[PDB]
């Protein structure tokens, strides 16, 4: 499913660009923050990367709605395509999970 425990950020880009479409996304372990996770999302033919905060009390994207589990966070943003914006602003839609 959408969770890939064994890939890097670069590997995530290669997958999405070769096996995904615009709107495809996956979750993977974080390099900058070992033990954490990161969303890798494809849009406009390019791959973008969103940090997932795990406080031990909840999951979020260092802001926005808080979630008890990683899966529910992902579920929420798949169901609310307008909630994840950069400050540009531009929307980043989690549409299609790229399965493992």
């Amino acid at each position: 499913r959408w969770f890939h425990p064994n890939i890097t950020g670069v590997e995530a880009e290669n997958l999405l660009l070769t096996r995904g479409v615009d709107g495809s996304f996956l979750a993977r372990p974080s390099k900058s923050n070992p033990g954490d996770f990161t969303l890798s999302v494809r849009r406009n033919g390019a791959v973008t990367h969103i940090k997932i905060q795990n406080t031990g009390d909840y999951y979020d994207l260092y802001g926005g709605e808080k979630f008890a589990t990683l899966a529910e966070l992902v579920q929420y943003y798949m169901e609310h395509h307008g909630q994840l914006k950069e400050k540009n602003g531009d929307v980043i839609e989690l549409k299609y999970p790229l399965n493992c």
């Binding site: 950020g9 670069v10 880009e13 390099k31 900058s32 791959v47 973008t48 990367h49 969103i50 940090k51 994207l61 260092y62 802001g63 926005g64 909630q83 994840l84 914006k85 950069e86 400050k87 602003g89 980043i92």
Partner: peptide, 11 residues
């Protein structure tokens, strides 16, 4: 090698 991360506006 190290990849791009977005600045988000969420709150």
């Amino acid at each position: 090698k190290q990849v791009e991360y977005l600045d988000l506006d969420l709150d």
